[PDB]
């Protein structure tokens, strides 16, 4: 169990909503698999009036991607800082031990790299995220964290001990943005991500979101981009939120098994209407659709979901079911 | 199991907090439950000075009527708009699967009525509340939501399978208001429920309530509207909320069977001091009564309980038991 | 099992964060322990740039020292109220029954004392704080809570009955505090505890804290006043928060067995990232060491931690182990 002398193997990480291939249940013996990530800074556009984000990013997306590997293997990761950026960055994984998450053995300045090593020993869907000293919050609302999937070698499993498993895999993270407003009552522009600083820091202060969004926008998960499923699929739903609370809910649907402190060898709850991600946490939900049409995703503070941004849609192809639900008279008028 | 051949009843409603006569245990086959609620629109006094709210209502109170079916029944709803409203409505139950819980099918504008009905499988209290394109926030914390639950055939149980009984039940919603103040530092009084939607959005978007009430009103379950029990007594208390979180507590009491994410195939948690409801959802929790007195019950964030209106009281009869607790010595000088 | 004619053992308390000397498992039957504290009220300094709190506490501590009992002991307390204060106190332990929690009992104005008994037959960790009629939350984030540790009598016991032991027990208080701005931008100084009420209660109502502490102030457990332990040791760390939700995390570690609604008849989770404390009770998760280092413990709203002061630290003594985590290449410029 020596890792130096485990077979080695590189993984090709892809862009949320997406999950990379892998296998649940596997027949492998523990190996190292290594990653690579690289830090973007840019401006992104947030929702549809024009609001700029200085954002800070792993790989380019918000959140970054999603790496799964299976408990007892050791993770592998190159961190890599390019020297377009500004900042110094490093990773904090929640699912490691020690050296504050591997965040004290992967400072980078731009131009730099480093290498670090660390055994999945626990299962579960674990956040990752930037940490410079200093700095913390910052980083992390401005964009960078993640999740880290490690599941057990037999796959998932219902309280009982029977098998459980997913078709389809999507990856969803929950970010609450402070967009500092001019004394005009428009939100600001910055030039640069260093100036964004001073406001910033301000609002963070008051508690309040300006915008709460799924994956880097208002209604990125929307119209084209909406997520997809058939009647019958079965998805496992993994919601990340690095440093606020956030509260679930399929409109029509339900979590059918829910891991909600996303730690696997726990059972999960069934049959949940809504669940709860602690801010710092990710958390996991099972959910097989039995009836076709549009569902919305979303923070069950309606106010968060509908005025700041947290929501999203899953498109579902299938045949309807009248005995789950029918529609027995249609609007009409009331008999006089 | 074809709903068109089962059994028909109607139940008759009754307005918080108390809830309509059912079984718990039951030895009847499945059969088609059928309700009636008719949306009233009417400005209502939540404190005591006076204060409005543009309120929206299911029957006439905050919250609506609690619905009660067992496991396997369906559930048979006519929903009534009538054309003394001015907005159009619908219901959504986070109990049901498919059309955004039934809200895609039971759209009705003033004058109109529509009949719906759904398979009600899993066990549990669950939120139903109000959700038109486009408003649903508003309609929702204006007062649109209330509880549907769902009992096991069997009754309730604990963790071992021991079957757990209540004397009475009630039924608790708890709604986080958003009163626009004035220039003048007051709060602003309404002439029509259309007048109140702009100032009132705004100050949904600081995420901050004025007031937060159970059932309605500041004080709403105080004094001769208090809930009463007495020693030796098993009570069910359901609570529900909406659009936030919150954590109920029973000063003097505990939580003897607690399931805070409300569904009833999860074995309950036991001898809570405090215990949560996400937003968008309802819990239930069981107790006993050991001794005589006033209990307080209210929302564990103490400024929201006691300055924004989330507190009620319980009036217990019965018999002192000085073995759980004794005053040994009463308040008296210290001495010299 | 009348308290009258049990064996009454006295216990000296000490100060946060240690905790007074205990069993885990006992042989011992059921006692009457007795206990005394006296509340203080006191101008204190929480924060580097000599912002000031008026703050009331039990026996001069923020929080009040940790009472551990076995379940089935009677607690014995006699609560002093010196007429050195100016306002009249009481307690309310969330570990008893009836009478507001003994707060109907131990009304004591300045010069006065009182004495309590009630039973303790629920296990678990339970908030205690004062509850003064009229002036409840005011006396609460103002310092007036602790916890109330009532072990079961065979120790506690993970999921499927196995024992579990810990080596050392820290206790932690995070108070949420609301200090006066005055016209000038700076925190405001005031000469007596009156004086601070009006402005202080309209702070409260806008819900967003001015600060957030462990244990009264911004670094009180950081530097010289860290939490110690060694490689291989257990340790159990105790969570209150009277008023206000929290989200604990341990920065390079994790929670081995968490009771997060602070329960111990319930079986724990494992492998937890971060735990969810409600307002309004005290949790517990015991995590064993196994990589030396300097570790932060804190509430994962990174805003809360860092900008408002939740944060501790925790100083580790022993060897790293390069199998549980390497740095495979230190920082070092990207090859070209
Ligand atoms: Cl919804
Ligand atoms: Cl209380
Ligand atoms: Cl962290
Ligand atoms: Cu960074
Ligand atoms: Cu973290
Ligand atoms: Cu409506
Ligand atoms: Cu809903
Ligand atoms: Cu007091
Ligand atoms: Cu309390």
């Given at each position: 169990a020596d890792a130096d002398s485990l077979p080695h193997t590189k993984v090709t990480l892809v862009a949320p909503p997406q999950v990379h291939p892998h296998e649940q249940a596997t027949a492998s013996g523990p190996k190292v698999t290594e990653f690579t990530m690289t830090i973007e800074e840019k401006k992104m556009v947030i929702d549809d009036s024009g609001t700029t984000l200085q954002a800070m990013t792993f790989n380019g997306s918000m959140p970054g991607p999603t790496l799964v590997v299976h408990e007892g293997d050791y993770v592998q990761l190159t961190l890599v800082n390019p020297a377009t950026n500004a900042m110094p960055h490093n990773v904090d994984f929640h699912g490691a031990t020690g050296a504050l998450g591997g965040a004290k053995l992967t400072?980078?300045?731009?131009?730099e790299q480093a290498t670090l090593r660390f055994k999945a020993d626990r299962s579960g869907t674990f956040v990752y995220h930037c940490a410079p000293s200093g700095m913390v919050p910052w980083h992390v609302v401005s964009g960078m964290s993640g999740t880290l999937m490690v599941l057990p070698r037999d796959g998932l499993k219902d309280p009982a001990g029977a098998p459980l498993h997913y078709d389809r895999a999507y990856t969803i993270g929950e970010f609450d943005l402070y967009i500092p407003k001019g004394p005009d009552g428009k939100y600001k522009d910055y030039a640069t991500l260093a100036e964004s600083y001073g406001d910033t820091v301000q609002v963070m202060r008051t508690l309040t979101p300006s915008h709460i969004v799924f994956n880097g926008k208002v209604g990125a998960l929307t119209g084209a981009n909406a997520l997809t499923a058939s009647v019958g699929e079965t998805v496992l739903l993994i919601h990340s939120q690095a440093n606020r609370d956030t509260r679930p809910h399929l409109i029509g649907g339900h979590?059918?098994?829910?891991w909600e402190t996303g730690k696997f060898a726990n059972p999960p709850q069934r049959d949940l209407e809504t669940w709860f991600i602690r801010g710092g946490s990710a958390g996991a939900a099972l959910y097989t659709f039995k009836q076709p049409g549009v569902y919305a995703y979303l923070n069950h503070n309606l106010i968060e979901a509908f005025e700041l941004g947290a929501a999203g849609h899953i498109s579902v192809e299938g045949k309807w079911n009248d005995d789950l639900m029918k529609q027995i008279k249609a609007p009409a008028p009331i008999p006089a």
């Open positions: 400072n980078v300045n731009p131009g979590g059918d098994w829910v």
